[PDB]
């Protein structure tokens, strides 16, 4: 008698939990997850502050009735990375790096070199084999100010820039002094080489030239994610 009543009580509760899980399944499947990562003094705080308007940090923003959920890690500041295993199912990884910090030395090698080493370590990780990277080249005006009418030259720090030519396909912004563009494309190619060294056709890179005051980052994040999902779906069916 008590047995029938309780088992009847227990059975109902499994049901009210299964209904709740079924309701939450659609919400879980709709959203997209991103991981925000970058070196120090790059400008991550300004970007996330601009994005919100309109030990961990979460931001929830909706574009075109699509839910994005971005994670930024600031509590864990260690050279060794073991918590990165939990981020093997994210849609994309956002990388923010200061483009103009070629001159600054942390004594240490130029920061660009540490950033490039970090990118190399991220790219070849075993658990991040099939995760794309969205690259933000921040501080677009400090670099121009340093390049134009500047005593400092990047050949002393980066020697290969002297033996370089600006790409024919490149399309410049209005009235750009010719050199600054060469410097930007040199910096971008130093990342594209690492990206394409061991791409294997499973994941790519999306370099971008973004300033801090720019308000179009929210569109770039949406478009790159859409392209990533489309490419993954095409590759699943053996069409690319």
């Amino acid at each position: 008698e008590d047995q029938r009543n309780e088992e009847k009580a227990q059975r109902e509760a499994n049901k009210k939990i299964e209904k709740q899980l079924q309701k939450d399944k659609q919400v879980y499947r709709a959203t997209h997850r991103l991981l925000l990562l970058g070196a120090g003094e790059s400008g991550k705080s300004t970007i996330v502050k601009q994005m919100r308007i309109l030990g961990i940090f979460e931001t929830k923003f909706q574009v075109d009735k699509v839910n994005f959920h971005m994670f930024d890690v600031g509590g864990q500041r260690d050279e060794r990375r073991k918590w990165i295993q939990c981020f093997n199912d994210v849609t994309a990884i956002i990388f923010v790096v200061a483009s103009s910090s070629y001159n600054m030395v942390i004594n240490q090698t130029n920061r660009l070199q540490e950033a490039l080493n970090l990118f190399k370590s991220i790219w070849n990780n075993r658990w991040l084999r099939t995760i794309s990277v969205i690259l933000f080249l921040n501080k677009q005006d400090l670099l121009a100010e340093k390049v134009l009418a500047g005593k400092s030259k990047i050949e002393d720090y980066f020697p290969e820039f002297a033996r370089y030519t600006t790409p024919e396909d490149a399309t410049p912004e209005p009235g750009e002094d010719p050199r600054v563009t060469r410097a930007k494309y040199f910096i971008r190619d130093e990342f594209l080489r690492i990206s394409t060294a061991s791409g294997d056709g499973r994941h790519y890179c999306y370099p971008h030239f973004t300033c801090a005051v720019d308000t179009e980052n929210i569109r770039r994040v949406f478009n790159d994610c859409r392209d990533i999902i489309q490419r993954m779906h095409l590759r699943q069916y053996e069409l690319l």
Binding site: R29, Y204, R226, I229, R231, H233, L234, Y237, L239, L240
Partner: protein, 285 residues
């Protein structure tokens, strides 16, 4: 010799049709990793193909070898109904798969919400109901019977089971089963090819300096196999009714039997993913 020779082929064909479909069905059912929304269409197609290979092929083979129908008229009608049902249901499933691929590729952000395990069952049930409504209903009733003397004589006799139809049914069934699910597939695959070309062009523009052989080699196979298998029959079906004394019975039977061969190639086309391969080794050994 001959009669023996044809018999040898009609057993190998039956075995090939049965084995692949049953293997696909058991591989999908046994493993929980392959339980996907897309895979329900594939198992529906495999079930239809298995029913075809187990119902219509052997008895038709016995008929053609013996050259005499040794069963009642009711069983002849049942055999014709099963044939029409299976043929109709073996194509709209391919159309549904093509539409699913179209939605998955062209609408990536809304793919999850559009298709759910609840809606896939409804779509499959609707396809099966439509396929069975045009097969059993107008065949069990005599709406499809012809009027010329040869058809009447064969209907009266209990030893001949041949296919005689009027223009209306021969046109309506062909339009419902073949012609409609062809333009949809053509348009869908053209759109998919355009999207793939656009993505490849974008990649080449992005990083061409540092760095249509797969798209064609896939789409051409997928479309051409079905088109070559099922095209001539669904032309002669209208031709031999529009003008009599033009198509011989032997050509009709040959084209109809060539159409049946398509039922053995579906696993070789839609089940070539690495997941299906890994699973196949475990079930087989």
């Amino acid at each position: 010799v001959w009669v023996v020779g044809m018999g040898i082929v009609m057993s190998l064909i039956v075995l090939a049709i049965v084995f692949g479909n049953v293997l696909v069905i058991t591989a999908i059912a046994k493993f929980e990793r392959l339980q996907t929304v897309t895979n329900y269409f594939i198992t529906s197609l495999a079930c239809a193909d298995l029913v075809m290979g187990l119902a219509v092929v052997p008895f038709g083979a016995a008929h053609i070898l013996t050259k005499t129908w040794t069963f009642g008229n009711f069983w002849c009608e049942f055999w014709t109904s099963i044939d029409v049902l299976c043929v109709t249901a073996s194509i709209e499933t391919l159309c549904v798969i093509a539409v699913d691929r179209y939605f998955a590729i062209t609408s990536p952000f809304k793919y999850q919400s559009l298709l759910t395990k609840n809606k896939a069952r409804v779509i499959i049930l609707m396809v099966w109901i439509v396929s069975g409504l045009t097969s059993f209903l107008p065949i069990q009733m005599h709406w499809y019977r012809a009027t010329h003397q040869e058809a009447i004589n064969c209907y009266a006799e209990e030893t001949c089971c041949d296919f005689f139809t009027n223009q209306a049914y021969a046109i309506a069934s062909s339009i419902v089963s073949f012609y409609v699910p062809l333009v949809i597939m053509v348009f869908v695959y053209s759109r998919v090819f355009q999207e793939a070309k656009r993505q490849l062009q974008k990649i080449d523009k992005s990083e061409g300096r540092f760095h249509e052989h797969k798209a064609l080699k896939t789409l051409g196979i997928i479309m051409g196999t079905f088109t070559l298998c099922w095209l001539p029959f669904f032309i002669v079906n209208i031709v031999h009714v529009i003008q009599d004394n033009l198509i011989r019975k032997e050509v009709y039977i040959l084209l109809n039997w060539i159409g049946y061969v398509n039922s053995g190639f579906n696993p070789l086309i839609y089940c070539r993913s690495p997941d299906f391969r890994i699973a196949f080794q475990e079930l087989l050994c």
